[PDB]
Amino acid sequence: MLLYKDVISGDELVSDAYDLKEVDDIVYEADCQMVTVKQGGDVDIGANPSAEDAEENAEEGTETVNNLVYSFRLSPTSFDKKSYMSYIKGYMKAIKARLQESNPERVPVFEKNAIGFVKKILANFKDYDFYIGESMDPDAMVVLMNYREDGITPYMIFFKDGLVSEKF
């Protein structure tokens, strides 16, 4: 029920309606489940000439999708290996300033903890993928999608430093 949004440019990055766990480091984890819904194509809010919506006569088009991405229309975008270093570097520094203006005591704990997680993320930045909200900003809240140690549990992480809690 809790709603967490970013102030830099995340806009509703995740919520507790699913489940959130903060790792000893400084990030939250919102688990997502798969649900089957009847979708008949969308392609943005308008962008098609003429169609029939028939395809076959033995299946309409049921597609399972995460409940967090569907409710928050999460939008995953492609990225570059070297481009990732520039986004995490200029983004980490951006937060460093937000602490100095708000809480300067979070500058050191945030640097050491965030530095450790970044080192374990580069080991497989591809397996963590890179998501982005409708804001379309490579310097806003960045969420990564990774499967637990099992693989049957899809979960994403949201930097707690750039995540606030909102009560209904």
From Swiss-Prot:
Keyword Cytoplasm assigned to the entry: answer is yes
> What SUPFAM superfamilies does its record include?
Mss4-like
> What are the record's GO terms for cellular component?
cytoplasm; cytosol; nucleus
Q: Where in the cell is it found?
A: Cytoplasm
| Protein keywords | Calcium, Chaperone, Cytoplasm, Phosphoprotein
Give the Phosphoserine positions (modified residues). S78
> What PROSITE patterns does the record point to?
TCTP_1, TCTP_2, TCTP_3
Q: What's an example of a GO molecular-function annotation for this chain? A: guanyl nucleotide exchange factor inhibitor activity
Q: Does the keyword RNA-binding apply?
A: no
Chief location bin: cytoplasm
Q: Which residues form the TCTP domain?
A: 1-168
Specify the superkingdom.
Eukaryota
Q: List the disulfide bonds.
A: none
The protein's matches in PANTHER family, at most eight in alphabetical order, are given as: TRANSLATIONALLY CONTROLLED TUMOR PROTEIN-RELATED, TRANSLATIONALLY-CONTROLLED TUMOR PROTEIN
General function of this protein? Involved in calcium binding and microtubule stabilization. May be a guanine nucleotide-free chaperone (GFC).
UniProt-recorded name of the protein: Translationally-controlled tumor protein homolog
- Provide the organism lineage as a comma list: Eukaryota, Fungi, Dikarya, Ascomycota, Taphrinomycotina
- What's the name of its gene? p23fy
